[PDB]
Ligand binder design. Sequence first.
Ligand SMILES: Oc1cc2ccccc2cc1O
Ligand SMILES: Oc1cc2ccccc2cc1O
Ligand SMILES: Oc1cc2ccccc2cc1O
Ligand code: NA
Lengths: 328, 321, 317
Amino acid sequence: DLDKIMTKMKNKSVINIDDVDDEELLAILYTSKQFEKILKNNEDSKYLENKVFCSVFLEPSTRTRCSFDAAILKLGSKVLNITDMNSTSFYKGETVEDAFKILSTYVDGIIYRDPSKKNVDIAVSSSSKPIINAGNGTGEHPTQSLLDFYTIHNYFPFILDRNINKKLNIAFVGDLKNGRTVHSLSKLLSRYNVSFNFVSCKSLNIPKDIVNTITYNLKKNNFYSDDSIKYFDNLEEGLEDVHIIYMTRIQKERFTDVDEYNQYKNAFILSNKTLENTRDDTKILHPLPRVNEIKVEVDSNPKSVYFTQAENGLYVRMALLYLIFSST
Amino acid sequence: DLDKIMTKMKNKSVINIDDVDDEELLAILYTSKQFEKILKNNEDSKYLENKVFCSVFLEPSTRTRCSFDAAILKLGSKVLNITDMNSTSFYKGETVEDAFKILSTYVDGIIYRDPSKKNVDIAVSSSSKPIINAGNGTGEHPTQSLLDFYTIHNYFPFILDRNINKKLNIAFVGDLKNGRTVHSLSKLLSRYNVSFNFVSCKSLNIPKDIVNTITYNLKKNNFYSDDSIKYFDNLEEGLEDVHIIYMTRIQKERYNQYKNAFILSNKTLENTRDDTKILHPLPRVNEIKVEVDSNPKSVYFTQAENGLYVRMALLYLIFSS
Amino acid sequence: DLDKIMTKMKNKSVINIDDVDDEELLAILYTSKQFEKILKNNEDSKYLENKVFCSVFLEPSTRTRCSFDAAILKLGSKVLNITDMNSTSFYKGETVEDAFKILSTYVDGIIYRDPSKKNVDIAVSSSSKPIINAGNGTGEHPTQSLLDFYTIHNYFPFILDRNINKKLNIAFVGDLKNGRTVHSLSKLLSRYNVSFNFVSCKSLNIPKDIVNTITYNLKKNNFYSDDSIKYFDNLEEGLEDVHIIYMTRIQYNQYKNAFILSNKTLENTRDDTKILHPLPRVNEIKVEVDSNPKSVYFTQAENGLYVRMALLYLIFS
Ligand SMILES: Oc1cc2ccccc2cc1O
Ligand SMILES: Oc1cc2ccccc2cc1O
Ligand SMILES: Oc1cc2ccccc2cc1O
Ligand code: NA
């Protein structure tokens, strides 16, 4: 019932993936699928024409910012842009609360990226218009999780059924400790019948916090067992019997010590060889950009869908904006 | 007669607040009010759709640039942005006159902000398209004046009457020397029955030429008396019988002694008139304590919101077909 | 004719002026002229409405970036801008191939300015959408050549005829060595019946390989003679009997004052001669020359709007 769902979603801020419930998630997946058909047939996509947004990006994140701008403008809307290298360079003396109180009288909605946990939450309480969090310091990047799930669901639509006999097995590989994308998508997937392989070097293990949350979310639907969560330090064991391989970025800005960065960047390299004993239906995701995590040769392997995944982002962002901001 | 005033304003540049006459001021106010009703009722505000603008900002002024962009885009028009720390990084060898001659062949109009006084005036005489000055070295910021006036007029509509028995009293408080906002609004208010309190430290006093322009403008409508301009030292005396309090920003560039001289608190407001309204061009740092935001005398966030309506109105009047 | 040409040009990347052949040049010039009429008569110009572009400028080049944005927006389209000082801050660890692969799934076309040739060539192979090169290190600046040629063609339309009895004579003046704009436009003009006067100081001479290409092109269309290419030291000889004077930017001290165009120096030129300069100018043309009817360098800049509109339209409609 897209109409009941849309009334509920209208004017919603999306800050954490838990702001999206089951019915909203189905509305987003369905709407995303419509926009995919629309774009792929070169149909008119201007379903949100009279809106003006502000996109405020207070750290270097030009790829994410451009993804949101492309979705706004493809919807037929307009966007003005605030971009700065950090938040203090923009706010200067001014409080986040004043800035958002006024900005929100200028525009119909705001896309906000700020590594400060606190700033996004201040923004939301002071804004008189809906905010979409495009990523913040505290591990929430909801539109990424949504586009990841959309992508997963396209190959394995049983993920939505909550069928005790149809379990999806995913391996997360790389920086589990700091990977926000992993945190947020884990939280979402664990609402469904999903089992997890965590593959990482010791100092980049998945945090306890995330494991507790995954545990809680699986138990809630009686899908939690001792086989639900496995831990591995090598690909040959961790890649066995998974439907999805999700490779994280290894972010240089996160590892000061360049030797640590060099150790972690080359610990898990996906090649055609490391893929030989995976399931025939397995699909490889990566939020992008990559550096050495996935060899170029893998781009020709039909198991890889990480470029399709990034393209799916346009559809899913358009869908989310449309559902929140349309007057109908 | 809006139709007759719209023919007059079409393709007008707005550089100084003296480019706007009494009747044009009325049409801006009236048109701003229409945009306010439209926007408050969540309605379709595409009143100017087929235009392309260039916004040229040659000092850091992110907020003002976003204000204008919002107005343009909300009207249904388009904008391209040139942004730089200073004007020399942008012009480099090239004359302002060449740059504006060419730019004007690409767009329908130009919003220009440049800390140089002279540049804007060069730009206007070289441009084949209207220019809106969004603030310059010579203390002219006419759209700020317009929106300030609109906000004042909302609470004290008699300011338009030039009735000898209904005088508006305003205190400007802070940096009067370098306050672009103060110079421009004083020039506009002084065409009406208004008296002025200037509250500042010695180093930041209002320039004489602003005093001359005020005096000259008041004399011209017989509103000048020896009471018309007073100068104070402290708030308690400065704020005494004033319908409007206008706090300036006190910005670091132009300091530790200046920044704490005049902070508006609920204390400093106890012996103002019941009906006084507080304006501030924004952003605010410490000039007004947060407690004053709940005091119903404060209207600075409405004032900034009003700027959407007034900028939309101005653009509409100048650029529509 | 034009729908056939448009089907051909649809989805073309324009990287070098040699990506544009005779018939594509004709469609560009025709369509440019239609946009000129439309704009000058205040008519609706929204011929490309549902398109979203990405403008990627990886060196400072504000004026060229604004021209393309103006043309996109005048067509009724939208643009998102990527706008930093070098390419390494933008690519960081990502390959140019991955970056363009993904960006071309988000947008309908890309306007790209990068001083690196390697980058532009990888972009074109990786992009699933057409790219327009907005200028690069190597002097390929095709939209500048196109608008230069449009401007020339307006005053001397015989340039397109390839008539042995109607030759256009052009002088290029200033920094011929480093003046990209010259190299590119020379290559385009040498497809036609054109003779060249190169006016420069010793150290800023036109490169021999540009002279080789010009020679080759003139021979191929049977327009080459021993008068085809002349070399000069000075304006008084150089400016003689030329339909076009093209002044370069001089972008030093001694080498930037040698050829300044004044009303005096124009006294013995043809009455019909037109003065172009790709702009901005510093000292190369005196302000007095702006009033002289022979000067068209501001009309030339304005024409650039029409020409960029035309090219965008023809590629992306
Ligand atoms: O994930 C990516 C998104 C992009 C968007 C715009 C331009 C380049 C991009 C590269 C990416 O890896
Ligand atoms: O104080 C202000 C903050 C702003 C933030 C974004 C856009 C416009 C703004 C105007 C303000 O006065
Ligand atoms: O010389 C030029 C100046 C410009 C200024 C603004 C936009 C485009 C411009 C192009 C020029 O050649
Ligand atoms: Na824009």
